[PDB]
Structure 1
Amino acid sequence: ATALTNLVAEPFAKLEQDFGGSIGVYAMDTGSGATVSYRAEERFPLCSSFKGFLAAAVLARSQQQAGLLDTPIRYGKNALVPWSPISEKYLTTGMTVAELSAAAVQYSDNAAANLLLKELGGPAGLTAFMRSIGDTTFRLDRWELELNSAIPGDARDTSSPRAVTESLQKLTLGSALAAPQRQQFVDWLKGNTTGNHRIRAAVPADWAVGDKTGTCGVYGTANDYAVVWPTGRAPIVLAVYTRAPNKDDKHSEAVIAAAARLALEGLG
């Protein structure tokens, strides 16, 4: 017999009703193939969370272009947009592509993300990279800061929890990238500084986590995705996305952490 997905799903429905919105979750246990799934194929805004995949796209390009990660990007003052705390420090020198990538992933730096998008041929170039690894759901259409609008019913700048999880697995654990690039992506995710109150909060401190967060700041829209390495057994990949119908509906980190915990405890 197969899993009773109603019983797996029920606690997410209670959680999202207290939240006043929708919660989407997909988790995969790479040891057993077990999954947990709730609204996993619905679209949610990416917000900042695209920046993880952006860094992966940069790493893929570095496989065709030796030394890409070493290349300095020397930008002018109009690259600077708010929530760019790392790129704002280096206006007088520039930053390398590696530094920009680290900042985009680990501080969610907005200007760094735009600078890397430009290197890859814009939002369409990142979307094309995702299509190359078989993700037909992901779409990035706009740039920082407009991509955060999170308007209900807008398909722009969205993906699904399942597609995010599947793509994250391919890139971090599968062989979609060469091993050095794969480990770099993992190391950048592991060094994230913005995720302590989201998926990380549901994971024992003994276990390594790499993640990328997103917070659109409107329509209850926020998210996190992660790889979790429990000691001595197969890693877990998961994504938790939220949205809500009213512009002034609050996002909640506690709800993301709670949904992560329900997903992790429900596997296998």
Structure 2
Amino acid sequence: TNLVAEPFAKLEQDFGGSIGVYAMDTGSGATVSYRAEERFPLCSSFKGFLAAAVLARSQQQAGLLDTPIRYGKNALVPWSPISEKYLTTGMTVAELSAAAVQYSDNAAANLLLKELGGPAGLTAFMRSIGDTTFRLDRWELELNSAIPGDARNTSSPRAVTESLQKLTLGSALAAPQRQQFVDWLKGNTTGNHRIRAAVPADWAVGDKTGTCGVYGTANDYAVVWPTGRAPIVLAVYTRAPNKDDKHSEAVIAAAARLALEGL
């Protein structure tokens, strides 16, 4: 049997769907794993990796992050609260990246995808850092459909955590770019009820959320710095069988608590 898994199984049964969890202590190598290699929809959570892919490009393209993008109304899509405010002035690539990560701005994400050569360009970046699981093939809003058994626009909790560790703590980005990615994640505004609700208040957190909403689908991944300790990387993804099944931020927080307790 798996006694470590039993509280996760009870949580997902009460939720009425499936929860996927992977957590690793980067100091000790201790892990907590529940459905860690199953696929779950990415939803908005792809935007963290998008920002990292833009930072990687910015190492070789002088002034890329400083470049003003002067987009029109045709670039705007629902839930673009930051992009709606700069139609006459524009935003720099850095500002679009911050908006995509910290407000989950959809127009900003589509403008940055265009920079990379679309969803195929982001998937190619993820392959370049050793992630064979990540798949993205749609723009906002089509990537959010989250239909059960559709492997498009999915990854696994384990592959998300492994890629997050490479980009935030490892050598996949040069140090100035690694630091910018960490700072964007630390400044996220959309995750206060998810992994952040599970961590002691004094611990530093960087995270990116995803909320397809349909089929009980939502997620969060984070780098967590416990006071005086090596960082923890973790991912919590959910899905459910019925289209009208509601996501739960409380279930994500609860799964994150069990992960931290299990390390």
Partner of 1:229: 225
Between the aligned partners of 1:7 and 1:180, the Cα distance in structure 2 is 42
Q: 1:92 deviation in Å?
A: 1.2
Deviation at 1:254, TM superposition (A): 0.1
Q: Please report how far the alpha carbon of residue 176 of structure 1 lies from its aligned counterpart in structure 2 after TM superposition.
A: 1.1
* 1:158-181 superposed Cα distances (whole Å, 9 cap, x missing partner): 000000000000000011110000
Aligned to 2:169: 173
Displacement after TM superposition at 1:235 (Å): 0.4
Distance in 2, matches of 1:122 and 1:57, equals 11
Once the two structures are TM-superposed, the CA of residue 105 in structure 1 deviates from its matched residue by 0.1
1:41 and 2:37 aligned: yes
CA deviation string 1:113-165 (max 9, x = no partner): 00000000000000000000000000111000000000011111000000000
Give the Cα separation in 2 of the matches to 1:108 and 1:77.
18
- Structure 2 residues without counterparts, runs of 5 or longer: none
Question: Deviation digits for residues 38-64 of structure 1, max 9, x if unmatched?
Answer: 000000000000000000000000111
Count of matched residue pairs: 263
CA distances 1:45-98 after superposition (whole Å, capped 9, x unpaired): 000000000000000001111111001111111111000000011111111000
Could you tell me how far 1:21 is from its partner in structure 2?
0.2
Equivalences for 1:108-119 in 2 at 5 Å?
108-119=104-115
For the residues of structure 2 that align with 1:236 and 1:66, how far apart are their CA atoms?
33
Q: Distance in 2 between matches of 1:111 and 1:8?
A: 41
Q: Structure 1 unaligned runs (5+)? A: none
After superposition, what is the alpha-carbon deviation per residue over 1:208-232, rounded to whole angstroms, capped at 9, x for unaligned? 0000000002000000000000111
- TM-superposed CA distance for 1:31, in Å, is 1.1
* 2:248 counterpart (242, 246, 252): 252
In structure 1, the residue matched to 2:198 is: 202
Q: What is the match of residue 2 of structure 2?
A: 6
Correspondence 1:187 to 2:149: no
- Cα separation, 1, equivalents of 2:159 and 2:84: 33
Of residues 233-242 and 64-73 in structure 1, the stretch that sits farther from structure 2 once superposed is 64-73
Q: Distance in 2 between matches of 1:235 and 1:265?
A: 15
C-alpha distance in structure 2 between counterparts of 1:235 and 1:264, whole Å: 12
Q: Provide the rounded CA distance (Å) in 1 between the counterparts of 2:201 and 2:50.
A: 28
- TM-score, with structure 2 as normaliser: 0.99
Deviation at 1:243, TM superposition (A): 0.2
- Matches of 2:4 and 2:85 in 1, distance apart? 47
Report SS of the residue matched to 1:70.
coil
Distance 2:36 2:63 in 1: 38
Counterpart for residue 91 of structure 1? 87
**Secondary structure in structure 1 of the residue aligned to 2:24:** strand
Give the CA deviation at 1:250: 0.6
Choose which of 46, 51, 70 in structure 2 pairs with 1:50.
Answer: 46
